[PDB]
Subunit: 118 residues, 3 copies
């Protein structure tokens, strides 16, 4: 999985262990190995939501599978709770988009994922 | 809708009301509520286009629906004109990608959009 | 094509000609005109991969076509080698996601790509 978390909160408000903890959280929720998870954090960014500059997170989650409609209820519950706990954001200020990828559309270790599997 | 505007123009050149005005513009063009629209602005960024560092904007627009081929002619006309007016970019220096999302692939308010609707 | 390269390497480690050279590389690999290629570079960014803060690049490549499973083996080989050469990253620290776009989903020069073609 490839995750991007952007927030208008300043960088000082996104704890140093945010990425590590989110990695563990998503490994469990998505049934994915921790070593296959990348997390980008972009803090101190201009973001509005309904034209408001109040604290908000906008998140993208890409993965080959593990993103069924049922799965995504679980990931949204967990990611949202995680952001509430760590970033102190309200539930309605965590916006997540999921991208369900084909293995022919991911490059890693110098070739596509499809080319490295059965 | 979730919108990301990246530009190599410095932040001082992206007016404070850019996000608010773009929100109103997209609410009208896309027939979406203003409160359902998030806008990220990333200025002062390294971007080339045809290898040139001239002023350019690269924009992503995600939405559940409202992105038919006909709709996207309208949004492109409006977003481009908006960027010409506010950022003083030429028409051929505004690049937009549209992502038409399923409601099972968006998390908001702690669950998926699909789980919150009829 | 619209390319985004994010790295936790500092900006000083991403050479000034990175974007120009990547443009030439992708023009050849993808059989696309250089003038149709935009490259965003975001360096000095927080990124972890398997919870590690070691040097890594996370890359997105969007294009109308030119992204067949066979094509993507080639682009991944070339982009990865390019990042090894210029950014001194290990092969297993270059992560790429491909997005194969419809022409109705790209705006350029004030209208959609579909509206400008045959």
């Amino acid at each position: 999985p490839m995750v991007r978390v952007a927030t208008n909160l300043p960088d000082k408000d996104v704890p140093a262990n945010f990425e590590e903890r989110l990695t563990d959280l998503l490994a469990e929720s998505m049934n994915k190995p921790r070593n296959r998870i990348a997390i980008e954090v972009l803090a101190g960014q201009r973001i509005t939501h309904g034209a408001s500059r109040n604290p908000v997170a906008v998140i993208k989650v890409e993965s080959i599978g593990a993103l069924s409609a049922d799965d995504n209820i679980r990931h949204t519950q967990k990611i949202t709770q995680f952001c509430q706990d760590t970033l102190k954001l309200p539930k309605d200020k965590v916006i997540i988009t999921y991208f369900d990828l084909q293995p022919i559309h991911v490059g890693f270790n110098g070739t596509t994922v499809a080319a490295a599997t059965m």
